[PDB]
Structures are given as structure tokens and as C-alpha cells.
Amino acid sequence: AKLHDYYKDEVVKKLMTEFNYNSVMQVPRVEKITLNMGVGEAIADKKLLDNAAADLAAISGQKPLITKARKSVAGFKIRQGYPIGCKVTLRGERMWEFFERLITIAVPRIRDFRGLSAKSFDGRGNYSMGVREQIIFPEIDYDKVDRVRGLDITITTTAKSDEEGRALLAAFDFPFR
Amino acid sequence: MLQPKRTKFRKMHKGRNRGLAQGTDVSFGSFGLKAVGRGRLTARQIEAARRAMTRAVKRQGKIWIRVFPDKPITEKPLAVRMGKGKGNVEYWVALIQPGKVLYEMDGVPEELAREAFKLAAAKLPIKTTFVTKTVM
Amino acid sequence: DKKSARIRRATRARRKLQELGATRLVVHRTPRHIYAQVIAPNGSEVLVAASTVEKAIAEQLKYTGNKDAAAAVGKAVAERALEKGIKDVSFDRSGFQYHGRVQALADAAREAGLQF
Amino acid sequence: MKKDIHPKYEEITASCSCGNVMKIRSTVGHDLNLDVCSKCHPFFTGKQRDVATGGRVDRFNKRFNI
Amino acid sequence: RNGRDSEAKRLGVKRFGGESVLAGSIIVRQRGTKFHAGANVGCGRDHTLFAKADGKVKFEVKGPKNRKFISIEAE
Amino acid sequence: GIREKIKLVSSAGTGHFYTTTKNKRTKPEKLELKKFDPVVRQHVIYKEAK
RNA sequence: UAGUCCGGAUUGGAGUCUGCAACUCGACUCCAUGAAGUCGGAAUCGCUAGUAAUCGUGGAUCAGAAUGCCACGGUGAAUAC
RNA sequence: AGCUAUUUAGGUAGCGCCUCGUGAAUUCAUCUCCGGGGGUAGAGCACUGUUUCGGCAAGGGGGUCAUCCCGACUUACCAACC
RNA sequence: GUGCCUGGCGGCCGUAGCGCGGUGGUCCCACCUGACCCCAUGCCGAACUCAGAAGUGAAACGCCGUAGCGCCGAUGGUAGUG
RNA sequence: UGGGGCGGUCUCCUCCUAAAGAGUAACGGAGGAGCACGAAGGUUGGCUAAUCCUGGUCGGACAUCAGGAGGUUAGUGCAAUGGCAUAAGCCAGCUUGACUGCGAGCGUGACGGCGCGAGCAGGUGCGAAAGCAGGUCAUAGUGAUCCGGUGGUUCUGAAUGGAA
RNA sequence: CGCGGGGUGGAGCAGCCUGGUAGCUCGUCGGGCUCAUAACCCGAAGGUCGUCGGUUCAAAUCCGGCCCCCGCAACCA
RNA sequence: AAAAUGUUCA
């Protein structure tokens, strides 16, 4: 959570002279991050979902929410109301605890790293990336898993334009290409 | 032969055909064929009349057909007693009111079109007259 | 939206009270100040109003944004209403969950004579 | 943060090939001995030492030798 | 085949504007809430608006979405 | 249909009962409702029967 | 006792030699990569002794190029009512 | 010479309609004024459907192929959505 | 004498609502700082909630200008009709 | 019964026909019901869509995630119509009013019958409380009488006391 | 006109009924046995259910429209 | 127990 302290001094001043904001409240703040972990194959086995939820509980610092089917899909054979995904919304200190724990610990452990994409912005200053292997988080001791647990990390900020969300992460030296 | 692609209901009430038409003024082409007599144009009559004028101009210009059938006229089988269900749909007519612009043309001279609509009118049942697009 | 969400929450309670011809005790909670005004059954004219913006209340407090501040406010609305002779009244949460500051205001009014 | 459902939070310690005295909170309940961090990044200069293709003339000149 | 139909429910407005009603008298037998309850009227479970107080019928159009209400004056 | 009728008999000092139905093929237990007992004028427990 | 330090196909790079010349189309070496394959369906084949089976060596043609062919020896059975 | 029910449809029963007796409220009717709810005729096309042309236009069919990963071009021409 | 401000509650329900541009923070309002506890998340101080108030007028809200739209809408004629 | 036979239909609910109150026919045009629920009921508190576009591991047009547009084109146990955000739509906590005895006053039927119902007495539960609740958003999910069965109540019980 | 049932690998038949999976014999392809063929033995492939529209999360299946086919009725003067 | 066939000329 020391990166939050980084924000309060380093980031804000580096940003007010970068886009020329007339107010300190107009610079972007990182709202929240959502660690979604789509399991999908939970219909094949219920404890497949339990193994999935346990690993996601390790990644974050809290118990995730078992999301279900919004609508019934026959393409993937799921009725209206079947648990198929697991998400958790880090907000506040633990959000910062996680944000820093990703950029200084996790990404360096990504096999064949070459930098992230600056095109992963939806268009509202909100960044959304996707890790393939969850193994880059030291929580999993490697010798307890059996599935390639992939999870998406989507950051929502208060930025009004996607390019403003970009330079926000440039303040934290968020690795790209 | 125009026919509604997948209509809402299969059969329909007979109804009456009253009042003056709506498409009175010519709005697409330069010349038109406005109806004067009341009546109903079946799909086969609109189809036949179109060929009559498409040959008159050889193939050229634009021929707008501002009227569409969209009204299934049913019919019983030959020699059957009355009642026991409504008839089966046979053809599709289009109720025409006086002052209705049936066709519209453009690109050809007035003499050619007044001659083209002459052929067209000989195929239609309702007494039709020639009209032109005026400003406003 | 925080505001309008709260307002459509208040409508049900308000429509029911404005059709029973009941005098209502409404309360608007804000981060810094609490409002309490009593409205007649016709709906346009109020009878008794008392909030933390009034000097006669604001002066004797420490900060106008806590339970005890409202506890004094609830006390005042029952005292001013009784010089008007208003004993039976009805309560409106006005979109606020009856839990903290609003709850403090209410019981202070109940123990002050205003029976609602 | 309702209790009894979320795992523990201890201030864990992390090391690096750079000798990073890194103390971050996590739910491990161990002591992590890591190789790479943001201070011993193989990326920042790894880009220029990644692409070196687009040359065969000097490569070919080692065979002509003159 | 066709030929099946239901027997009429005799709905509609039983008492019109200005009529003197008695408490408990049915004003309108609507189906849904075509007519909302105004003042001194109750909405039954059949959605039947009746008079909760004997008086005079008063049709009005109030509300932000402009709906019809049937009120009754204390006559 | 599949829903057969049961007789909710009181556990009080009377032979009064309420009649209702029950989905025999989804509910293994007996119905338990604290209903009014129109004799001793109080609310008692009505366990089901046939 | 494991797709295992089994297995070696395949492929990228880097070389040596023969030969005017190795791209189509050689052999071999080095590093890396490292699949199929866990005793094989119906059916079928060789052999009775230093043979079967197994291991390694040489020769012819040949500039170079065989796991083929011709030839030699080491180890060395079982069974034939 | 209507409604409702009827092993009922050319019968019958109750109500409606006729007549006689008796008792009662300007009670009832026509008209002007006032208070009403309607949603039909007509009209309209935001809605549920349907229709034509024009513009934009994914998407599309067939061609020419690089006739390999990629993709491009063209078109006898079909076409949603706003 | 009052006027411009602002918050709440209603009347009236688009001539009142959208859009565009500007603008206000001493007050009021909002955001906001913090959260061991009251209380809450089918995960999370997002919301709910409490404790407080540095900072800000960005968002939101309010006010003004603007008709680009929604909206309101004659007179006359026409349709319909007793 | 557009002669009879054959085919079909017979009760109930929704729309149209139906001519702007109600009602209104045909072997006229379209569809459905013969149940379901212990919660899908009661209540308190809270929440509010469908479909597209952008980004994101497996993952594709569509699984789950975040954001935007949008606006109820969604949903409501079932057909259709009417209705619904104060939501009647969606989630959770707590319970049984899916309550007994009545019921001013009207609606609708020839009648049998059917429907709505403020309020009163008893007792219950939800909410701090105002109040709310005697089934379910409404309209279908149903059959008279006789005869006979089971339980309760001493009302009766052919001489009296019992009993059938 | 009217009525019942049916169409599914190349051929002839199951599966529908109670929706989520398409089986059966022959034929067919490859190997084997034989001097060669048949027969026999081993292994595998091959059908989006006539078609169109809708219903549901989902259509071989449910509903409706149409075609081909088979059977049935076309009686009373 | 099963156990069929073999184009014409030369």
C-alpha cells in the first residue's frame, strides 16, 4: 500500500503539468479492480468450482463472489442461474495492496514477457488486461494446482478519456510496449 | 406479382373502401398515373401493368410502384355449400381510392410517358388519368 | 445516483402518508447538518421546523454532524410542536434507513412528548 | 470486511536478485525468495537486446572473408 | 379450428362523474389499474375501485406520468 | 393433478382441522402451520394428516 | 518403474569433407528441440544345432553416399511324445 | 317471434314484452345548460406488423486470383441498421 | 422598503424535458479524509453507516445564454357524422 | 348441423367481429385451461431491465468481468388483453392473515349461483412506528342434488335410561 | 374437396410417445484368408431427420404452412 | 460338421 503514498505526492504533481488541470480533483484516481475468474467447466464438477474459488481467494485477500448466468445459454449448455464465474472487487487499501503486488511482483514472473498493450483500454480511461497462468502470484506453491487458472484484471479509473488512463499508469511505470 | 413477405395474420375481414386517397401528390418521379375510379387492384393486375410500361420505354428510366397489395382476399372451393369455415386465400388485392398515384416515372419525355401510361391503363380495371409532379 | 435513488425510496412511504391525511414529521440527513420539519396534511405549509443550521441549536453543540446533535434537534421539534399543541403526528424516513442519526432524532422526539 | 471468511493478512517479506528489501502485505504466511522484481527488470533494456535481425551482409562477408 | 370464446365479464365504469354514491359502492370494474385510486377510494384485489366514503365521484388527471385518478368528495 | 389433499389436524384439545393440498413428490416432511383454533380461541400448531 | 537420465523422429542455428557444383538431392559432427511408441487386431514367418537369438568387425560397387548385399567371429538356448 | 336453460332446437321453464287490480315518489319521457367515462368513424406511422424508392452501409453471392500463411481486386449484383 | 442566493416540502405534470456553451462554493450542497466500534457487502466503506472535515467546484446539482431537437399549436380548409 | 350421414363441436379464460357505457350471432378469424407454490404466500428493508458497442485467459456470434449507449424494445410459474418502477419485476432477513365469527353497501345473472368490499369482535405475525396482511398483478385451473363414508357436537332419540 | 399415417446414412427399418444423445441388417471402404472370386474373419467410415416459419435455454422429437407417398371415404334419391 | 466357382481361341 506504499504505492498509494506514491500517488499522493509523485503522481498528482506529475499529472497536473501534463494535461494542465485547473484542479487537484480533476486528475484520475484508480477506482477499483475486478479480478474475474471464469471457470465455465463448473457444470462438469462442483468441486472444480471449489478448487477455482480457493485459488482466487489466494490471489486476492478475500473470499470471491460466485457469479451466475445472467441469461440461459444453450451454446455452452447453461440454464438461467448456474454458477459459472468468480469475481472479487478490491477497493481501498487492499486494492492498493494488490495493485502494487502485481506490478512489482507478478508481471516479472510472466513467461516470455515483452510488455503489455496500450490498446487494452476500452475507451473510458479504464484498463483491462488478462493473465493466462495464475502462477505468477506467489500464493500458489505450484504443487497443489492441476488446472491452468486464468483470470482477468480490469482496472476502472475516474479518467474521462482512454489516453488519460494511459499516462496515469505511465506515472506508476506500468510496463507496456 | 407482389405479395407480403410473412404477414401477421393469415386471413382478413372484407371491410369497406371509402374516402379519398392519401398519396395524392406525385413525390418521386416527374409523371404519374393517378386513379379516378374506386376499386381494388389485384397483384396480377399491378404486375401486368408494370410490364406494359417497361416495354414502352424499352427498359430505361425509373418506374416507381407506389401501391402494394397487402390484403388477402379469400375464396371457397368450386361447388361447395355455404358455411363450415372461411375460404382459403387465393389472391391479394389493394383497395384503391380516387386520387391515388399508382405509378411514377422519370427520365423519359412527357410524350413518351403519356403514351407509356396509356398502355398501363389499358390493363388496369379502375379508370385512371395522367398527372404530373408539381412544385408544392 | 445517490440522490434520486433515495427519493424513489421515499415515495412509497410518502404517498401512503399523504393519502391518510396525516401530519408528517420529515427528516433530511446531510453529512454536515440535520433537518427536521413538520408538514401539515395539505402538503404545502409546514408548522414546526428545526435544524442544525439554526443558531439557537448550532451554538450549543460541538459539531452539527453527529447523533447527539440530532438528539438535541429531535428534542426541539417536540417542544416547538407542543406550543402549537401537536401531539399525534406521523413519521417519514424520507429515504433514510431508520438506523443511526435519524433514529437518534426520533426517540428524542418520542421521549419529548411527540407521540408518533 | 465481514470477519471469518477472508484469509489472513500478514506483512510478508520479499527478496530479489537485486537485493530488494521489499516488505509487502499478502495472504501467503511464508517468506518469499524471488528472482525478478521491478528493480531487476529484464524488460527496460531487454527490448534493444531482443531484435538483432535484419543483417546478413556482414554475416555473408565472413564466408567471402575478403 | 375456431369457435371457442369466453362469456363477457360486464366491465367498465359503473358510476360516472358527479354521481352520488354510497360507501362500498363499486365505481369501476376495470381489469388492470386503468384507473388509479384517488381519495376516499380503495382498490380491490380484482382491481375493482370502490367507494370508501359515500359522496360524489370526481374524475381527475394527476401524477407526473399523467394518470387518471378517481376521487370522492365527502358529501 | 399430482397435488393430493391432506388434513391439518390441531395438536390442541380439539378435533378441529384445516383442509389443504400438498405436493407429495417434493415434500417428505409434514406441514406445520401455527393457525387459529376456532374453539379454544388461540394459535396452536396444526400438523398434517389424511 | 516414471513417457521416466526410456526413445529418438523432427525441426532451427552452426560447421567438416568429397566433388566443377550439395538448391531441387549427399554423408557426418556440435548445441538446442525432442513426437509417435508401454509388447501390438484378424493373420502370418524363420530355426533343431554351436542353429535360434544377440553383439561388434571387414569387403565389393565407390570421388562421396546403405539400416541393403556378400563375408567373419564373440556370447549362446529351448524343444522334437 | 328476444335472452337464459333444457337428450334441447317446430316443446317447455324463468325473465323481457301484453292485460286487469292496488298503492306510491314531477317518479318517467322530449329539450336547453352542466358534470362524465370513453376510443368506433376519420386520421396517423412513435409502437406491434407490413411496403417502396433514395443515402450511408456492415454483412453477402459469384468471379480474378497469392491460385500456400496474408490478403486484394472486381462485380453480371443481393442487403440489415440509422 | 426588498432583491439576488441556497436547502427542504408540495402545487402543476414536457411552453416545464434533452442537447450545446458558460458559470457558482463566504454560507448551503456535493465530492471528499478516515473507520476499532454502531451498521453493511449473497465479494468490497461502491452502496448502506458512523466519526469528522484538510482540499475542491472536476463529476453531480443549481442558475444563466442558446431553438440543434422533443414539446405546445391557431385561423381556414378537408375527412367524418346526428 | 346452411337436408341427413361422415368430419368437427358441446364447459371455462383472452383478443377481434361488437357500430367509443354494458351486452350482442354464425360450422366467423386467432390462442389457451382441466393446474402449479410451502413458497412463486404475508411483511420489513433494499435493488431495477432487453439488446447492442469497446476492452479482457481458455472463450467463438453469445458463458462470467468492467465501462458506455440505451431505455423497459425486459420481466411477471402458463394464452392473450389490460396493468405494473410508489413497481405487481428482482434479492435477503423474519414469519404464517393460505385466520375464526360477521359484514354497511354495490356489481352481475331468469334463477341456482358468482364477484368486490370499508368496517366490527377475537386472536397472530412483520415493522421503531404510520400502517400492512382473511391467499398469489388481474381475468381460466371447474361440476348442482341425492346417496354413502370419516371426525366433532348429548340437538334428537317413538314406554323410561341408553344406543343405533 | 374430406380423413389417418409416413418421409431419418446408398437400400429397407428403429428412435418421437416423456425434447437435450441418432441405433439396426445389408451395402461400402482398408487389411486378412485363397493360385484368384465368393464365403468367412478383423477394423473403420458414412445420416445435422423432406422443406419453411415459430415455440423453448434447447427441436429427430412440439405446433403450424407446403410438397411427395400410402391407405381410407366419396352413402340416401 | 462346413467346404461353391474358374471367359473364348491356341
PDB file of N, CA and C (backbone and C1' of nucleotides) in Angstrom, chain J residues 2 7 14 20 34 45-46 53-54 72 78 86 99 114 126 130 137 147-148:
ATOM      1  P     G J   2     -73.814 -25.959 -40.404  1.00  0.00           P
ATOM      2  O5'   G J   2     -74.927 -25.449 -41.416  1.00  0.00           O
ATOM      3  C5'   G J   2     -75.106 -26.085 -42.688  1.00  0.00           C
ATOM      4  C4'   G J   2     -76.509 -25.853 -43.193  1.00  0.00           C
ATOM      5  C3'   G J   2     -76.672 -26.012 -44.693  1.00  0.00           C
ATOM      6  O3'   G J   2     -78.015 -26.371 -45.008  1.00  0.00           O
ATOM      7  C1'   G J   2     -76.770 -23.702 -44.083  1.00  0.00           C
ATOM      8  P     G J   7     -67.367 -39.647 -37.957  1.00  0.00           P
ATOM      9  O5'   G J   7     -66.616 -38.314 -38.415  1.00  0.00           O
ATOM     10  C5'   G J   7     -65.373 -38.377 -39.150  1.00  0.00           C
ATOM     11  C4'   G J   7     -64.864 -36.986 -39.465  1.00  0.00           C
ATOM     12  C3'   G J   7     -64.757 -36.017 -38.297  1.00  0.00           C
ATOM     13  O3'   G J   7     -63.576 -36.229 -37.527  1.00  0.00           O
ATOM     14  C1'   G J   7     -65.759 -34.920 -40.138  1.00  0.00           C
ATOM     15  P     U J  14     -62.065 -13.432 -19.784  1.00  0.00           P
ATOM     16  O5'   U J  14     -60.864 -13.433 -20.831  1.00  0.00           O
ATOM     17  C5'   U J  14     -59.566 -12.937 -20.460  1.00  0.00           C
ATOM     18  C4'   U J  14     -58.738 -12.651 -21.692  1.00  0.00           C
ATOM     19  C3'   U J  14     -59.455 -11.960 -22.837  1.00  0.00           C
ATOM     20  O3'   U J  14     -59.644 -10.566 -22.618  1.00  0.00           O
ATOM     21  C1'   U J  14     -58.137 -13.714 -23.696  1.00  0.00           C
ATOM     22  P     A J  20     -70.519   3.170 -31.032  1.00  0.00           P
ATOM     23  O5'   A J  20     -69.068   3.534 -30.485  1.00  0.00           O
ATOM     24  C5'   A J  20     -68.120   2.499 -30.164  1.00  0.00           C
ATOM     25  C4'   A J  20     -67.216   2.951 -29.043  1.00  0.00           C
ATOM     26  C3'   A J  20     -67.929   3.618 -27.883  1.00  0.00           C
ATOM     27  O3'   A J  20     -68.547   2.688 -27.005  1.00  0.00           O
ATOM     28  C1'   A J  20     -66.081   4.933 -28.496  1.00  0.00           C
ATOM     29  P     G J  34     -54.227 -27.268 -17.343  1.00  0.00           P
ATOM     30  O5'   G J  34     -55.664 -27.758 -16.847  1.00  0.00           O
ATOM     31  C5'   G J  34     -56.273 -27.187 -15.668  1.00  0.00           C
ATOM     32  C4'   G J  34     -57.447 -28.024 -15.201  1.00  0.00           C
ATOM     33  C3'   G J  34     -57.196 -29.519 -15.020  1.00  0.00           C
ATOM     34  O3'   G J  34     -57.944 -30.001 -13.903  1.00  0.00           O
ATOM     35  C1'   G J  34     -58.991 -29.201 -16.511  1.00  0.00           C
ATOM     36  P     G J  45     -40.014  -0.407   5.412  1.00  0.00           P
ATOM     37  O5'   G J  45     -38.561  -0.881   4.944  1.00  0.00           O
ATOM     38  C5'   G J  45     -37.398  -0.629   5.768  1.00  0.00           C
ATOM     39  C4'   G J  45     -36.168  -1.309   5.193  1.00  0.00           C
ATOM     40  C3'   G J  45     -35.795  -0.997   3.751  1.00  0.00           C
ATOM     41  O3'   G J  45     -35.127   0.258   3.613  1.00  0.00           O
ATOM     42  C1'   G J  45     -35.611  -3.321   4.119  1.00  0.00           C
ATOM     43  P     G J  46     -35.235   1.079   2.228  1.00  0.00           P
ATOM     44  O5'   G J  46     -34.328   0.256   1.206  1.00  0.00           O
ATOM     45  C5'   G J  46     -32.912   0.117   1.427  1.00  0.00           C
ATOM     46  C4'   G J  46     -32.336  -0.961   0.537  1.00  0.00           C
ATOM     47  C3'   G J  46     -32.420  -0.739  -0.966  1.00  0.00           C
ATOM     48  O3'   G J  46     -31.372   0.111  -1.437  1.00  0.00           O
ATOM     49  C1'   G J  46     -33.077  -2.951  -0.459  1.00  0.00           C
ATOM     50  P     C J  53     -22.337  -5.697 -31.552  1.00  0.00           P
ATOM     51  O5'   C J  53     -21.504  -4.419 -31.087  1.00  0.00           O
ATOM     52  C5'   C J  53     -21.440  -3.234 -31.909  1.00  0.00           C
ATOM     53  C4'   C J  53     -20.691  -2.131 -31.189  1.00  0.00           C
ATOM     54  C3'   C J  53     -19.344  -2.522 -30.597  1.00  0.00           C
ATOM     55  O3'   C J  53     -18.298  -2.524 -31.569  1.00  0.00           O
ATOM     56  C1'   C J  53     -20.588  -1.341 -28.976  1.00  0.00           C
ATOM     57  P     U J  54     -16.992  -3.441 -31.333  1.00  0.00           P
ATOM     58  O5'   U J  54     -16.265  -2.750 -30.094  1.00  0.00           O
ATOM     59  C5'   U J  54     -15.609  -1.471 -30.235  1.00  0.00           C
ATOM     60  C4'   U J  54     -14.855  -1.124 -28.972  1.00  0.00           C
ATOM     61  C3'   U J  54     -13.987  -2.233 -28.401  1.00  0.00           C
ATOM     62  O3'   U J  54     -12.740  -2.349 -29.088  1.00  0.00           O
ATOM     63  C1'   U J  54     -15.249  -1.255 -26.658  1.00  0.00           C
ATOM     64  P     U J  72     -38.771   3.405 -21.999  1.00  0.00           P
ATOM     65  O5'   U J  72     -38.919   1.825 -21.802  1.00  0.00           O
ATOM     66  C5'   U J  72     -38.897   0.912 -22.931  1.00  0.00           C
ATOM     67  C4'   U J  72     -38.952  -0.528 -22.449  1.00  0.00           C
ATOM     68  C3'   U J  72     -40.225  -0.936 -21.707  1.00  0.00           C
ATOM     69  O3'   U J  72     -40.470  -2.338 -21.875  1.00  0.00           O
ATOM     70  C1'   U J  72     -38.382  -1.097 -20.240  1.00  0.00           C
ATOM     71  P     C J  78     -44.930 -17.271 -16.870  1.00  0.00           P
ATOM     72  O5'   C J  78     -45.848 -18.474 -17.375  1.00  0.00           O
ATOM     73  C5'   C J  78     -45.425 -19.324 -18.463  1.00  0.00           C
ATOM     74  C4'   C J  78     -46.622 -19.978 -19.126  1.00  0.00           C
ATOM     75  C3'   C J  78     -47.757 -19.050 -19.543  1.00  0.00           C
ATOM     76  O3'   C J  78     -47.458 -18.256 -20.708  1.00  0.00           O
ATOM     77  C1'   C J  78     -48.658 -20.880 -18.351  1.00  0.00           C
ATOM     78  P     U J  86     -42.654   5.414  -9.522  1.00  0.00           P
ATOM     79  O5'   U J  86     -42.853   4.660  -8.127  1.00  0.00           O
ATOM     80  C5'   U J  86     -41.845   4.728  -7.083  1.00  0.00           C
ATOM     81  C4'   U J  86     -42.394   4.188  -5.774  1.00  0.00           C
ATOM     82  C3'   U J  86     -42.901   2.746  -5.793  1.00  0.00           C
ATOM     83  O3'   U J  86     -42.740   2.164  -4.496  1.00  0.00           O
ATOM     84  C1'   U J  86     -44.688   4.187  -5.261  1.00  0.00           C
ATOM     85  P     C J  99     -56.854 -18.564   4.888  1.00  0.00           P
ATOM     86  O5'   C J  99     -56.441 -17.884   6.275  1.00  0.00           O
ATOM     87  C5'   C J  99     -55.852 -18.670   7.334  1.00  0.00           C
ATOM     88  C4'   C J  99     -56.538 -18.400   8.662  1.00  0.00           C
ATOM     89  C3'   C J  99     -58.044 -18.191   8.660  1.00  0.00           C
ATOM     90  O3'   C J  99     -58.780 -19.396   8.465  1.00  0.00           O
ATOM     91  C1'   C J  99     -57.004 -16.790  10.272  1.00  0.00           C
ATOM     92  P     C J 114     -71.629 -19.743  -5.215  1.00  0.00           P
ATOM     93  O5'   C J 114     -71.071 -18.651  -6.233  1.00  0.00           O
ATOM     94  C5'   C J 114     -70.418 -19.046  -7.457  1.00  0.00           C
ATOM     95  C4'   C J 114     -70.033 -17.829  -8.268  1.00  0.00           C
ATOM     96  C3'   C J 114     -69.219 -16.772  -7.541  1.00  0.00           C
ATOM     97  O3'   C J 114     -67.837 -17.113  -7.446  1.00  0.00           O
ATOM     98  C1'   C J 114     -70.948 -15.718  -8.748  1.00  0.00           C
ATOM     99  P     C J 126     -42.861 -11.574  14.078  1.00  0.00           P
ATOM    100  O5'   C J 126     -42.984 -10.620  12.809  1.00  0.00           O
ATOM    101  C5'   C J 126     -42.442 -11.012  11.535  1.00  0.00           C
ATOM    102  C4'   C J 126     -42.447  -9.840  10.583  1.00  0.00           C
ATOM    103  C3'   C J 126     -41.896  -8.540  11.145  1.00  0.00           C
ATOM    104  O3'   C J 126     -40.469  -8.505  11.150  1.00  0.00           O
ATOM    105  C1'   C J 126     -43.921  -8.103  10.013  1.00  0.00           C
ATOM    106  P     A J 130     -48.207   2.345  14.824  1.00  0.00           P
ATOM    107  O5'   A J 130     -48.216   3.373  13.606  1.00  0.00           O
ATOM    108  C5'   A J 130     -48.412   4.785  13.828  1.00  0.00           C
ATOM    109  C4'   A J 130     -48.578   5.506  12.509  1.00  0.00           C
ATOM    110  C3'   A J 130     -49.623   4.922  11.572  1.00  0.00           C
ATOM    111  O3'   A J 130     -50.939   5.348  11.925  1.00  0.00           O
ATOM    112  C1'   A J 130     -47.636   5.363  10.362  1.00  0.00           C
ATOM    113  P     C J 137     -48.353 -11.909  -6.400  1.00  0.00           P
ATOM    114  O5'   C J 137     -49.364 -11.396  -7.520  1.00  0.00           O
ATOM    115  C5'   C J 137     -48.956 -10.438  -8.515  1.00  0.00           C
ATOM    116  C4'   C J 137     -50.122  -9.555  -8.891  1.00  0.00           C
ATOM    117  C3'   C J 137     -51.314 -10.274  -9.505  1.00  0.00           C
ATOM    118  O3'   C J 137     -52.161 -10.848  -8.510  1.00  0.00           O
ATOM    119  C1'   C J 137     -50.774  -8.408 -10.836  1.00  0.00           C
ATOM    120  P     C J 147     -80.545 -38.389   0.632  1.00  0.00           P
ATOM    121  O5'   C J 147     -79.630 -39.607   0.166  1.00  0.00           O
ATOM    122  C5'   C J 147     -80.197 -40.752  -0.503  1.00  0.00           C
ATOM    123  C4'   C J 147     -79.101 -41.704  -0.928  1.00  0.00           C
ATOM    124  C3'   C J 147     -78.107 -42.068   0.161  1.00  0.00           C
ATOM    125  O3'   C J 147     -78.606 -43.100   1.009  1.00  0.00           O
ATOM    126  C1'   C J 147     -76.929 -41.474  -1.797  1.00  0.00           C
ATOM    127  P     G J 148     -78.284 -43.059   2.584  1.00  0.00           P
ATOM    128  O5'   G J 148     -76.712 -43.319   2.660  1.00  0.00           O
ATOM    129  C5'   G J 148     -76.169 -44.623   2.369  1.00  0.00           C
ATOM    130  C4'   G J 148     -74.659 -44.571   2.265  1.00  0.00           C
ATOM    131  C3'   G J 148     -73.873 -44.020   3.446  1.00  0.00           C
ATOM    132  O3'   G J 148     -73.761 -44.932   4.536  1.00  0.00           O
ATOM    133  C1'   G J 148     -72.963 -43.171   1.448  1.00  0.00           C
TER     134        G J 148
END
